[PDB]
């Protein structure tokens, strides 16, 4: 059997201000510690990624669930996806409204339906039938983001989130969740709910979770493109640098990903300014935002 791993990430974009840098650091750690925990105790790769992204979703500091950015109407519209590499089972939702955790509902889609992807009205109807509580719009909206929008009509890092794991039985997974872009049109769907773009998981290769400007990530299929390079004989760092290499040069898009290979090698790389990220393996925690600021602490 294999040593478990969990990698998680925040926004793949601009510099984080001194202010929020302690909260960001804290949130990635809580996120990865939840993930590793499920993995410490024998749990699944999917439960570990569902786990970590749920913590981040609830944390107002991350651009997912509560604290998601506003659309043009000043409304929170969220998307998310999950996938299990064993047989490639997958779940996604776009432009979901009035719920704390889209990733959980994406996981509901994956095991409680014949489908892989529900949107808007129908995804709302499937939430209800499943018993997901409706919370008012204002439980999701923050004064930070309330400002962000009003000042966008007339350098940032929002906090798109994701997670990849490997469990003790050699199974991989990913989850990604986002509140989208600031001032996005109504019903704009980015890369997070789209298999192969927002993320991909395959037992025979590895798992990726991406962040950045969705539109580019979607155009280049960033997640599947990374894994195509791994099959091609490249290392996790090599593949990342190449896949991220194309996105900058072909579509002028920057950002970041995280990867775990089927064999336990892991990396976090970015062409944007910064990506918050944490990694938990072998009783230590790995963390970082700016290039080469990486710290290691032993985990309990």
Q: Enumerate the active-site residues.
A: 160
Q: Which of 12, 27, 67, 102 binds Na ion (CB under 5 A)?
A: 67
Q: Is residue 77 part of the contact set for Na ion (CB under 5 A)?
A: no
**Rg (Cα) of the chain, in Å, rounded?**
17
DSSP for residue 194: S
Segment contacting a second copy by CB under 8 A, of 18-26, 39-47, 168-176, 182-190? 182-190
Give the closest residue to 174 by CA, choosing from 127, 206, 219: 206
Q: Is residue 94 part of the contact set for a second copy (CB under 8 A)?
A: yes
Length of the chain: 300
Per the listing, tokens 């590895």 go with 206
Q: Would the annotation count 11 as a binding residue?
A: no
Which residues does residue 257 pair with via DSSP β-bridges, in sequence order?
Answer: 210, 269
Closer CB to a second copy, 39 or 158, in the complex: 158
CB of 170 to a second copy, least distance (A): 17
CB of 89 to a second copy, least distance (A): 8
Give the closest residue to 44 by CA, choosing from 89, 78, 100, 94: 89
Answer whether 36's CB lies under 8 Å from 6's CB: yes
Q: Would the annotation count 213 as a binding residue?
A: yes
Give the closest residue to 255 by CA, choosing from 233, 277, 234, 238: 277
Q: Which of 124, 259, 278, 285 binds a second copy (CB under 8 A)?
A: 124
Q: Which of 28, 123, 173, 260 binds a second copy (CB under 8 A)?
A: 123
Give the closest residue to 65 by CA, choosing from 52, 78, 82: 78
DSSP for residue 18: G
Q: Provide the mask over 138-177, with x wherever binding to Na ion is found by CB under 5 A and - wherever it is not.
A: ----------------------------------------
Q: Is residue 198 part of the contact set for a second copy (CB under 8 A)?
A: no
The CB density around residue 169, as the number of other CB atoms within 10 Å, is 13
Q: Which of 65, 102, 212, 214 binds Na ion (CB under 5 A)?
A: 65
CA 121 to chain centre: 23
Give the closest residue to 156 by CA, choosing from 223, 77, 69: 69
Near a second copy in 205-234, by CB under 8 A: 214-215, 218-221, 224, 228
Identify what 277 binds: Na ion, a second copy, none; CB under 5 to 8 Å per kind.
Answer: none
Binding site for a second copy (CB under 8 A): 87-90, 92, 94-95, 113-126, 184-190, 194-197, 200, 214-215, 218-221, 224, 228, 250-251
Binding site for Na ion (CB under 5 A): 57, 59, 62, 64-67
């Amino acid at each position: 059997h294999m040593n478990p791993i969990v990698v998680v990430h925040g926004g793949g974009a601009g510099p984080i201000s001194k202010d929020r840098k302690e909260r960001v650091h804290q949130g990635m750690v809580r996120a990865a510690t939840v993930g590793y925990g499920i993995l410490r105790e024998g749990g699944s790769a999917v439960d570990a990624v569902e786990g970590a992204v749920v913590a981040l979703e609830d944390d107002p500091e991350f651009n997912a669930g509560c604290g998601s950015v506003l659309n043009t109407n000043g409304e929170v519209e969220m998307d998310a996806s999950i996938m299990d590499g064993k047989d490639l089972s997958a779940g996604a939702v776009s432009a979901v409204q009035c719920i704390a955790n889209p990733i959980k509902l994406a996981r509901l889609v994956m095991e409680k339906t014949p489908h892989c992807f529900l949107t808007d009205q129908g995804a709302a109807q499937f939430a209800a039938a499943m018993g997901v509580p409706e919370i008012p719009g204002e439980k999701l909206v923050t004064e930070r983001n309330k400002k962000r929008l009003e000042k966008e009509k007339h350098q940032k890092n929002l906090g798109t989130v994701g997670a990849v794991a490997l469990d003790c039985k050699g199974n991989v997974a990913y989850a990604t969740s986002t509140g989208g872009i600031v001032n996005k049109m109504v019903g704009r769907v980015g890369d997070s709910p789209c298999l192969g773009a927002g993320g991909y998981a395959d037992n025979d290769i590895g798992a990726v979770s991406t962040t950045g400007h969705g539109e580019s990530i979607l155009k280049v299929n960033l997640a599947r493109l990374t894994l195509f390079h791994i099959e091609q004989g490249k290392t996790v760092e090599e593949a990342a640098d190449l896949s991220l290499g194309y996105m900058k040069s072909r579509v002028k898009g920057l950002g970041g990903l995280i990867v775990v290979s089927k064999t336990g090698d892991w990396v976090a790389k970015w062409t944007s300014t910064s990506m918050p990220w944490a990694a938990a393996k072998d009783g230590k925690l790995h963390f970082g935002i700016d290039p080469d600021d990486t710290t290691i602490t032993d985990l309990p």
